[PDB]
Amino acid sequence: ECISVKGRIYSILKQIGSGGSSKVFQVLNEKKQIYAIKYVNLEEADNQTLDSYRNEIAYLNKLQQHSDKIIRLYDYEITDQYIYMVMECGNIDLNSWLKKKKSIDPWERKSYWKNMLEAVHTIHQHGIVHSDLKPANFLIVDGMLKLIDFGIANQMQPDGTVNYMPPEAIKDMSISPKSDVWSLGCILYYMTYGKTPFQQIINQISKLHAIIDPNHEIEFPDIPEKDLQDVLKCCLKRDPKQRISIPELLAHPYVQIQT
């Protein structure tokens, strides 16, 4: 029913998220303002994971200044036993919203695209490459996608797919900013064609076969927005060296040409 963080009290109104030993609550302060609060129980945590949490917090904090396309962290508490993160509250994670909506509006989809670019651009500018990027990581907050996590700390599932893994991450076992470009591509592909590139492929053992396979070609059906079709093509190129960059993407006409 009730969470104390650095003096203040919040009433738990609902659980929204539930990773390993972490839980996210939709809560309310005394003035009845909403906030998401992340509780991470630490009793079991070993130094690797403990450092991962400390790392996420520090970056999440640092990055506050640079962009509003990053989840806002209002304040936090941390002891040897727990973590509480008081954060901004949104409407829905993107993943759970790409199921709900039938097919997206052009103007919104572009807006969401800009939003993600700015977000991922920011983490890159601070030497972070979020390797496991996916729509579950973004969060709608009054017409804005904001980034929830950095792939530094262990992932939470909102109350795990391989649709977004980039080639070079699969071909890896015997990293690049470009990895995130692929994953963002996949999210945008979804937002134009109602599905990811390989989400019709059934078996996962072989889902990661199509991805790596140069001979396997990806289907880009024509659409009224010719720019968008190019972005998709440029993002989903299998060779990191020849895949478009975030800074290139930010100057692409899809983001830049008006209407």
Ligand SMILES: CCOc1cc2c(-c3ccc(C)c(S(N)(=O)=O)c3)n[nH]c2cc1-c1cnn(C)c1
């Ligand atoms: C596992 C999901 O993580 C988060 C979810 C949220 C939300 C949120 C997400 C989904 C829903 C459906 C809602 S809702 N409409 O308020 O119930 C809020 N707001 N702020 C949030 C902040 C987080 C979060 C978790 N870690 N970090 C760093 C941010």
